Amino acid sequence: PPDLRPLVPLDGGRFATSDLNDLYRRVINRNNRLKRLLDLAAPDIIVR
């Protein structure tokens, strides 16, 4: 849930991203990339 990984305001226009948010972003980006690559019928080496 978002409250367990909150983005505390930094009173400077930015927010402090927790490590969990960064890891979730990495996972989401990699999953989207894999889905796009398999949708395009990528070669065996790239898919692996």
Partner: protein, 162 residues
């Protein structure tokens, strides 16, 4: 004796890495496909590499060592399975040479007669139908009112894809 390898390059540095590897006198290959993109507000046709951040390089480790290719100012690393770097068979290279596709590209799909979600402006959070690109800055959708949908052209950045 010459063999092919797969190379993972840094983000937004494929051209510089390719130029450097050409200066290393090695064979380079990267699929190229042109298509329409939003381009932060201008639905213009530009060429993007198919399978981005992937290059296929033909050379001989004896003539030029692997670590030289690894650190050629634009090469993130070698695509390796195990200790040794992976070797891509020539059949895959032959297939990629004649690889001439036609694709839609998912995130750049403001196609005519296509469902598009507007999350900004007076029609925020409303589903409409892109039907023709009006110029470049302001694409044209059948903006949905409570009664019906009406021809209207608004800024590209206002709406995303459903």
């Amino acid at each position: 004796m010459q063999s092919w390898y797969l190379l993972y390059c840094k983000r937004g540095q494929l051209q510089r890495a390719q130029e450097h590897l050409e200066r290393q006198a090695v064979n380079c290959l990267a699929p190229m496909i042109t298509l329409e993109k939003i381009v932060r507000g201008k639905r213009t046709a530009v060429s993007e590499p198919l399978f981005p951040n992937y290059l296929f390089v033909e050379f001989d480790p004896e003539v030029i060592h692997t670590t030289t290719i690894n650190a050629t100012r634009g090469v993130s690393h070698f695509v390796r399975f195990g200790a040794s770097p992976a070797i891509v068979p020539s059949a895959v290279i032959h297939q990629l040479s004649v690889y001439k596709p036609k694709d839609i590209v998912d995130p750049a799909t403001p196609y005519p007669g296509d469902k598009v979600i507007i999350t900004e402006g007076a029609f925020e959070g409303f589903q409409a139908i892109f039907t023709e690109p009006d110029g470049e800055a302001r694409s044209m959708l059948l903006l949905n009112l409570i009664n019906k949908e009406i021809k209207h052209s608004v800024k590209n950045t206002e709406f995303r894809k459903l």
